[PDB]
DNA sequence: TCTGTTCTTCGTGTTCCTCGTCTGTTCTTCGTGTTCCTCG
RNA sequence: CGAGGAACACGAAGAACAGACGAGGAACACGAAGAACAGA
């Protein structure tokens, strides 16, 4: 059981310096090479660094050096990247990584973060139930929802019945552009279970808002 | 610099067939000491990815031995015979040679399946919206089997794409297709200009394009 | 033109620390082969 | 006739030693590539 833990989701503002603490377990520290993977989402991975535990080696890529800093500590078990120089176009997810041999290549992941840059100011969401077009079931088949508007973070979890109804159901991304965000999701439920099953919309929010709306 | 070239970026895969991804590289692969040594690592979505494949063909500790490794040269093949279900995801292949050692991505697995019919439904805004001067017409279209979809938005007999939004989804685990939400957002002030809201979409299976008009 | 020195990239050789690989040697156990002994 | 204990082996498992390979940094005497303050 050599498996990873990372903090947490961390949101930070432009300009500043903001932290990486890297846990792990089993075997270990010393002998071995932490190494360390960016990913952006929508485009391929990437890798940023590696520090040996033993001597310190410090190295970093041919376009990353001088940007962000690669320290560990033994006795906390712990990696640390510190970064600067920051814009919002790194508001993505960063893995921690166990080395199998020589920093050649990796064996196991950590789960990362989620490093994002805030803008504008965090606002609660606005929850809409979706509603029918004729009301009570006229069909085969009835299709109902939740459209949400106005949020700023992202951790804007949607769960209907409090993690329950995982089959026929639309989980849906968030779009990032000038701030504004927009959830709109969609499950399409059978014709007898209307007035009994009314399945709530529920957006689980931790800076703002933990939200139930019934349609 | 570092470029790798994944020249099987999609493939059609359903669960008992074969398939061979060759991850080609844009220069020669070969060491000081004659071996090569190239990684393939699998996500899938919703945990962190794993070590698969780590030299050619030998592998980690514990994984199933139905997968396979091959080639040497420029070009590098991974076999697969009677796919299952529970190893969907993204392959990686890492650049065994130059001194950047840089990742590469662009390989997904694509399960293959029967086409799926259209669902398509509208929603008129609510009124908690209709009280803020805005609105936002939402057309619901599912069940997507192929990725090549064109939609458009009519309001009275005029073509405007502007003010819309469109939202997608990913590979899904059970339904194994996609789906598909397109909203139009304006004022109140920009809603009531016209009458009648119309989205119209651009599938395969249905040969003519699917187009749905409602009033309110 | 160089030195007192400082801020950086690449080698000439050695040692320290960790590791994945390969070859020979040795100890114990197991599906079992050679003589003695024993078990029905 | 079937099998086991004692010393050796066909092959396999756990372990250790000896040698070599390369992978990553550290230290030292010297070499190449750009520069600056003062001195001769």
């Known amino acids: 059981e050599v498996q990873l833990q990372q903090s947490g989701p961390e949101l930070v503002k432009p300009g500043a310096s903001v932290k990486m603490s890297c846990k792990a377990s089993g075997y270990t520290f010393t002998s071995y090479v932490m190494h360390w993977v960016k990913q952006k989402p929508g485009q391929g991975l990437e890798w940023i660094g590696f520090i040996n535990l033993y001597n310190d080696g410090t190295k970093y890529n041919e376009k990353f050096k001088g940007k962000a800093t690669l320290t560990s500590d033994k006795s906390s078990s712990t990696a640390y990247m510190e970064l600067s120089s920051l814009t919002s176009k790194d508001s993505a997810v960063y893995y921690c990584?166990?080395?199998?041999?020589?920093?050649?290549?990796?064996?196991?992941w950590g789960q990362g973060t989620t490093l994002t840059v805030s803008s504008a100011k965090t606002t609660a969401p606005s929850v809409y139930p979706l509603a029918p077009v004729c009301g009570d079931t006229t069909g085969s088949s009835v299709t109902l929802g939740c459209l949400v508007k106005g949020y700023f973070p992202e951790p804007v979890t949607l769960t209907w019945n409090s993690g329950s109804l995982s089959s026929g159901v639309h989980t849906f991304p968030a779009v990032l552009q000038s701030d504004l965000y927009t959830l709109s999701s969609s499950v399409t439920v059978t014709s007898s279970t209307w007035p009994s099953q009314s399945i709530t919309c529920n957006v689980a929010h931790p800076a703002s808002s933990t939200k139930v709306d019934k349609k | 610099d570092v470029l790798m070239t994944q020249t099987p970026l999609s493939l059609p895969v359903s669960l008992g067939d074969q398939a061979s991804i060759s991850c080609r590289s844009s220069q020669s692969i070969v060491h000081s000491n004659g071996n090569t040594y190239l990684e393939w690592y699998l996500q899938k979505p919703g945990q962190s990815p794993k070590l698969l494949i780590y030299?050619?063909?030998n592998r980690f500790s514990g994984v199933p031995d139905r997968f396979s490794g091959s080639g040497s040269g420029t070009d590098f093949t991974l076999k697969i015979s009677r796919v299952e279900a529970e190893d969907l995801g993204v392959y990686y292949c890492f650049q065994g040679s130059h001194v950047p050692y840089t990742f590469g991505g662009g390989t997904k697995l694509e399960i293959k399946r029967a086409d799926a019919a259209p669902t398509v439904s509208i929603f008129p805004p609510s009124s908690e919206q209709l009280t803020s001067g805005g609105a936002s017409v939402v057309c619901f279209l599912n069940n997507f089997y192929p990725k090549d979809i064109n939609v458009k938005w009519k309001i009275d007999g005029s073509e405007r794409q502007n003010g819309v939004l469109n939202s997608w989804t990913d590979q899904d685990s059970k339904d194994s297709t996609y789906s598909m939400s397109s909203t139009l957002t304006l004022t109140k002030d920009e809603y009531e200009r016209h009458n009648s809201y119309t989205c119209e979409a651009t599938h395969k299976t249905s040969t003519s394009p699917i187009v749905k008009s409602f009033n309110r």
């Open positions: 990584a166990r080395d199998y041999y020589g920093s050649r290549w990796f064996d196991y």
């Open positions: 030299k050619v063909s």
